[PDB]
């Protein structure tokens, strides 16, 4: 056992040395000569009311007009944000929902939370009512995130320090991803859908191949739990928001952290993160009841979304980049632009 | 607008009405978070998530047991029922550390903890037997004496009372180390047979609401 520990320490030292030599320069000093964004002044164009408890999760549909919202009141609501209408009101079986997702086709929506089950709901069906299609049991810890790959493939991350890929038709785990020491709090599917990254409470991020089922890379730059993870639209990087009160942008081809986003006055953790269509604006939702629009290339707060009376829990963008959505503990979902 | 959009708006209005009705029905309940560890009777206090519902004096309580990030979910909850086992002393320090962690939890700075000390019957039996001495685990016990005028008992052993009060004092002065008065630890005793636990929780929740009101009025 001592020989194994020595070999592990030597391999870790080799990894650190090899990745330390690849750092010829720093993204911060490579982006010191560009045009800064300025002020990202975003007004609340719509405010969605009807949720009577903390909003925990929200996910845009593929058409950038429909969105799902899951709140602690135990109700999934589909919003037509163009006319602020309620297309559907989905009552959940458990009110401790921490994540929700919208199928790319638009026929299904996924939701999960403290019950360790990812429930799938069919929207577009005869009889004119949303109904439960499939429940995905097998995770040991609470579900932190979930994202559809297609009508029959969904990746989830749980607090048991694992991520899973599920076939919905068979409702079976095709692949299990292992290696995280802490609870996995967020997962982001790649634009190609081949890979996905996950951050956990062990203050590390890991990149996983969906088909192979192995861990291609592992990242560690945080000194606190990573609560949110979002893939850069290019698919060759990601961003992680942690309890460290900072965000951090990692790459995949370099295998080491590239940027950190922090403020002296910012001591609250980062509840959520997301990227604009350009990926040039890393939008983060904090616990201080507001969101910061970080310049992902400059790591500067070029904007603030201060309209929430409580913690911002969820923060996402449309697929066309025309609006952002922020859901807070004040029980109101807001669309900003 | 179009006739289709008029019908869509009508449907949205009906959905809003249904949501308002559901919220009005669900607003009255009081939530509680159950915390503890094994061999502590945590889940044997009242008779994914093992949520339970029980009513006392026309007040409905929803106790939630989970199975420490996720505690954020229970941030606006009435109280935390933190059960501890005061029968085994080797893990008593572990329970004290867990109590410290929960009491100082950033998300729980305003949540009063209804602290429970279980299996006091086992604790008394161990004290009577004398096989294990709390002083072996907490040396300060050897230099501890029960308060003279604050020992209301039904006629129990002075040794049992002294040990119980020592453990309770350790927990209570961990609680009051830094509380600022925004939340209070309520200690109690349970022997797995005392059915008067829901009453204690109800009284402590009433006290918590009363303290919140007084703080709003600056009377406290």
């Amino acid at each position, epitope marked *: 056992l001592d020989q194994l520990r020595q070999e592990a320490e030597q391999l870790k030292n080799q990894i650190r040395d090899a990745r330390k030599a690849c750092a010829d320069a720093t993204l911060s000093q490579i982006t010191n000569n560009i045009d800064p964004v300025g002020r990202i002044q975003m007004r609340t164009r719509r405010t969605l009311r009807g949720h009577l408890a903390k909003i925990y999760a929200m996910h845009w549909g593929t058409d950038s007009r*429909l969105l799902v919202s899951a709140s602690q009141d135990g109700k999934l609501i589909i919003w037509d944000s*163009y006319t602020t209408n309620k297309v559907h009101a989905i009552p959940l079986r458990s009110s401790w929902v921490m994540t929700c997702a919208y199928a790319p086709s638009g026929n299904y929506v996924a939701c999960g939370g403290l019950d360790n089950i990812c429930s799938i709901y069919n929207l577009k069906t005869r009889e*004119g009512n949303v109904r439960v299609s499939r429940e995905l049991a097998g995770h040991t810890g609470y579900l932190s995130c979930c994202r559809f790959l297609d009508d029959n493939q969904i990746v989830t991350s749980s607090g048991d320090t694992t991520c899973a890929l599920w076939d919905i038709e068979t409702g079976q785990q095709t692949t299990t991803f292992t290696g995280h020491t802490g609870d996995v709090m967020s997962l982001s599917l790649a634009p190609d859908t081949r890979l996905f990254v996950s951050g956990a409470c062990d203050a590390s991020a890991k990149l996983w191949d969906v088909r192979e089922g192995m861990c291609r890379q592992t990242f560690t730059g945080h000194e606190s739990d990573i609560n949110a993870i979002c893939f850069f639209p290019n698919g060759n990087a990601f961003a992680t928001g942690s309890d460290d009160a900072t965000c951090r942008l990692f790459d995949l081809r370099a295998d080491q952290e590239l940027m950190t986003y922090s403020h002296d006055n910012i001591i609250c953790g980062i509840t959520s993160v997301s990227f604009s269509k350009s990926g040039r604006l890393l939008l983060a939702g904090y616990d201080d009841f507001n969101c910061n629009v970080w310049d992902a290339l400059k790591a500067d707060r070029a904007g603030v979304l201060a309209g929430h009376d409580n913690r911002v829990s969820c923060l996402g963008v449309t697929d066309d980049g025309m609006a952002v959505a922020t859901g807070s503990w004040d029980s109101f979902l807001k669309i900003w632009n | 607008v*179009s*006739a*289709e959009d008029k*019908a*869509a708006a*009508e449907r949205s209005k*009906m959905i809003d009405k249904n949501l308002r009705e559901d919220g009005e029905k669900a607003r009255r309940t009081l939530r509680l978070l159950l915390l503890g560890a094994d061999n502590s009777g945590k889940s044997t206090i009242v008779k994914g998530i093992f949520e339970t519902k029980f009513q006392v004096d026309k007040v409905n309580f929803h106790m939630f047991d989970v199975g420490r990030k996720w505690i954020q979910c229970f941030n606006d909850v009435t109280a935390i029922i933190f059960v501890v086992d005061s029968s085994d002393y080797n893990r008593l320090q572990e329970a004290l550390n867990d109590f410290k962690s929960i009491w100082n939890n950033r998300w729980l700075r305003t949540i009063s903890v209804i602290l429970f000390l279980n299996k006091q019957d086992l604790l008394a039996e161990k004290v009577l037997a004398g096989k294990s001495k709390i002083e072996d685990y907490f040396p300060e016990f050897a230099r501890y004496t029960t308060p003279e005028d604050a020992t209301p008992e039904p006629g129990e052993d002075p040794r049992v009372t002294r040990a119980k009060y020592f453990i309770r004092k350790e927990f209570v002065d961990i609680s009051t180390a830094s509380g600022d008065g925004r939340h209070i630890c309520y200690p109690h005793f349970t022997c797995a047979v005392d059915t008067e636990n829901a009453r204690r929780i109800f009284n402590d929740c009433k006290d918590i609401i009363l303290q919140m009101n007084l703080r709003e009025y600056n009377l406290v």
Partner: single-chain antibody, 231 residues
Framework: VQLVESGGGLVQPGGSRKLSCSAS????????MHWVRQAPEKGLEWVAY????????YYADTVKGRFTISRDDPKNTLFLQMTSLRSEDTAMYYC??????????????WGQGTTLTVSSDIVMTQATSSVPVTPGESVSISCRSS???????????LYWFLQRPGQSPQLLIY???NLASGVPDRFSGSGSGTAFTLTISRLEAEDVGVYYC?????????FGAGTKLEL
């Protein structure tokens, strides 16, 4: 999804009758109901409309005042009370379901009607009252409208129904561009302002009947004359 309709029978002029439509197979409470009649040999004619929850009700000027439309959601039934029957009120009556929300298909399901015999508005026209066709050929059927059915929200409110002999109308295309469920992908629709066309490629058997185009921009709901396709 079934909509079984009852009523009909012989009626003396000037009397009254009650038509019923029992629904079974969908969330009736969430659907708005419609009544559409068809003269013995003429086209289709909208009659009435009741929305979900009975909040909004509409009638046809031709029968307004004498007709009443109601619904019993717990009983899952739709009722049409008729009063002061005229010699022009002899026809086959159908009940239709239509749910209204973003990306929905109104007039999705019709039913088998009941026969009744007694002893301004947007207008769309179909120039072709009969168009012989052959199997395997491609047929385009156009039907224009009085005004532009395009709306500010971007929806072109045109619907297509096919009525095969001895059968109820069935929806094919809704909002002039969206295919229905269960309809083979051979059918399609397209066009621009006031110019609406329906294309059928690789025409096959079981595709013979009267095509009707309908509008939904504003009440009353008016049908076309009806283009009949023969072998």
């Amino acid at each position: 999804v079934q909509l079984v309709e009852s009523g009909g029978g012989l009626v003396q002029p000037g009397g009254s009758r009650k038509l019923s439509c029992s629904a079974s197979g969908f969330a009736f409470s969430s659907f708005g109901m419609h009544w559409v009649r068809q003269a013995p040999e003429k086209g289709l004619e909208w009659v009435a409309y009741i929305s979900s929850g009975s909040g909004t009700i509409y009638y046809a000027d031709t029968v307004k005042g004498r007709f009443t439309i109601s619904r019993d959601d717990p009983k899952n039934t739709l009722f049409l009370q008729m009063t002061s029957l005229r010699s022009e009120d002899t026809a086959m009556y159908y009940c239709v379901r239509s749910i209204y929300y973003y990306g929905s298909s109104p007039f999705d399901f019709w039913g088998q009607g009941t026969t009744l015999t007694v002893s301004s508005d947007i207008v769309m026209t179909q120039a072709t009252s009969s168009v012989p066709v052959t199997p395997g050929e491609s047929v385009s059927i156009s039907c224009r409208s009085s005004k532009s059915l395009l709306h500010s929200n971007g929806n072109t409110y045109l619907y297509w129904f096919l009525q095969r002999p001895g059968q109820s109308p069935q929806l094919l295309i809704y909002r002039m561009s969206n295919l229905a469920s269960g309809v083979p992908d051979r059918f399609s629709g397209s066009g621009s302002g006031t110019a609406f066309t329906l294309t059928i490629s690789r025409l096959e058997a079981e595709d013979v009947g009267v095509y009707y185009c309908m509008q939904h921009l504003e009440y009353p709901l008016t049908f076309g004359a009806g283009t009949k396709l023969e072998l």
